[PDB]
Amino acid sequence: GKTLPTRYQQIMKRLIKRYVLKAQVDKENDEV
Amino acid sequence: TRYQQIMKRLIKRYVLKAQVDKENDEVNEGELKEIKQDISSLRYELLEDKSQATEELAILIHKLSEKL
């Protein structure tokens, strides 16, 4: 103050799954 | 009226143009994976066809050998 002069593991599992699916899908968009 | 006909014509032209232009773009690996998968599907299906044909021919041959 300057006036004057558990849930964690489940969230992480969900995000990691999302990231893996996203990367696997994006690898298909690249060139041949 | 004329308005609806003109709009129908232009919309049809635009849809055909977009569908044709989507083919000019670069290739997606999903298409090669899909072609590969359909090739393997065809392989399995033709193997099953050859197997059923061999079974039918064997049944006919067993019948012909038992008739004699």
Next chain:
Amino acid sequence: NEGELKEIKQDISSLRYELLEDKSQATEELAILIHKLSEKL
């Protein structure tokens, strides 16, 4: 051009249908021959 991949896919499916029809006609001929052989006995 994607048209070339679509065209290759279409020809693959054409080949699939044609070979299925060939297997069907072959099975019909074999069944006719088997019916003849079973009726001869």
Next chain:
Amino acid sequence: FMFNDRGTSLTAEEERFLDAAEYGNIPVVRKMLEESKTLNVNCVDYMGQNALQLAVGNEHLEVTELLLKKENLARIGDALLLAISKGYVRIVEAILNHPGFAASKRLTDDFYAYDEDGTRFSPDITPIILAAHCQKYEVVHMLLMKGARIERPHDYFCKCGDCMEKQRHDSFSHSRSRINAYKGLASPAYLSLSSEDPVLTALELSNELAKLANIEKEFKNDYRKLSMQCKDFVVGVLDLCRDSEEVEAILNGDKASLSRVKLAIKYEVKKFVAHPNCQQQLLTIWYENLSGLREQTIAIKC
């Protein structure tokens, strides 16, 4: 600490079943559909897609059709969304003829929920939204042929009951669902297949998206991108014409009452007015009465 899906890989029989259903080994799955112990959910894979899910993943129409005749499958809505995403019209149409989908399950929670929680693709999104995102035209025609109009997103400053309830305790997802609805409404497909005329709706939508980009400071790049895409749709549709009558009905609508160009410059659609066809019509009206000087040699005679 490697995360997993099941406790342990239980069955080798059904593992082989799943791995043959992956590569489309239709004699194996057909022989095994009727004689096996159980066609369970077989998500032993690291990510956990059901045999139906996996089969739809790789465009196996025979496998999908043989599985839809089992009446004991889950993840159906999820497989439909996935197939819309890829863009395989055969599989989507085959899934739409499955029982239970006769209750108008589109825009009329327990469904789509794969992995017993956390369904992919933005839990506020219905099939038609994904279909408009993925530019699939036949899919849009299929869905709209069964109804399910997209929903209009509410006003930003509006303090209605539902908007207020979803503002408190639901913040940062209200803005996200709003930007999602605006992303779906602004696709070329939906704009070309929904309304009577796309031109007027597109222009006014572009202006509304620009105003909302100015109001809401965050995500400014996204609203800018959407409205630019809509400008480009308008310019393309205008360019695709080939007759005088067409360019007249586009530029004016139902040269007295030259309105749509006026609204275009009022909404600031740069590339619309600068098109060679628009420019041609403007230089035909600009030298209206005297033509002997329109074809003049140089500016010295002028």
Next chain:
Amino acid sequence: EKQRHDSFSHSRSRINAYKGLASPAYLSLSSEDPVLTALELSNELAKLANIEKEFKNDYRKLSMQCKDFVVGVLDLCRDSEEVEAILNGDKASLSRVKLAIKYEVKKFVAHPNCQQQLLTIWYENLSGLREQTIAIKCLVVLVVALGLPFLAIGYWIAPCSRLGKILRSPFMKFVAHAASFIIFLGLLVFNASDTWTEMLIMVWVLGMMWSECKELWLEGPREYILQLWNVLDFGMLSIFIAAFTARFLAFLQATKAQQ
């Protein structure tokens, strides 16, 4: 033992192990949480890029790739709970953003989701001005915040009131420090053109120096000299001190004389 008789292959195997540990795949499948491991690994790879001069491009590339993994994983979320568990971890105890800016992950903090959370906490108490029309109303609000006596009286006499809760919001502290700086400049300019003003300026610069004292006391001297603007601020306040002490010495001497 692997340094002697085995040189140039020890550094190569080291860079190989660091290239493998920094892949998106291994980082996403090995550890319990990838975010913290990735950030700390990025900082370690940057430090080793600075230490070992050769192959600097390679370590730079690896640590940039790790920054990009972190930013992507953060971007892929869709709920309030997820962005909160990512930005903070197990809005009290806002730590992972602090470590992110300490390790200098540029694109991490500049993401629209992080920015959204920061602008929700930034206008914490007063929302009626977060949705304000233009910056002209904000300028009007600062001009009306130029009324310091009301604020000081209400703060030290009876806190926890409506105005006591308003002052406990970050935008207020910011605009109040800006107003103090502005009125200091104003007093300077007023004193410029044609005794009380002199002492007021002296008290203001003494307050600035006490603020800087409380500032550099919090951390070690190295953290104090770390920034560059603090050096200029310190030099400026000390110059004011020296000038006013010279004026005071001259005043005392002339007073004794003409006395």
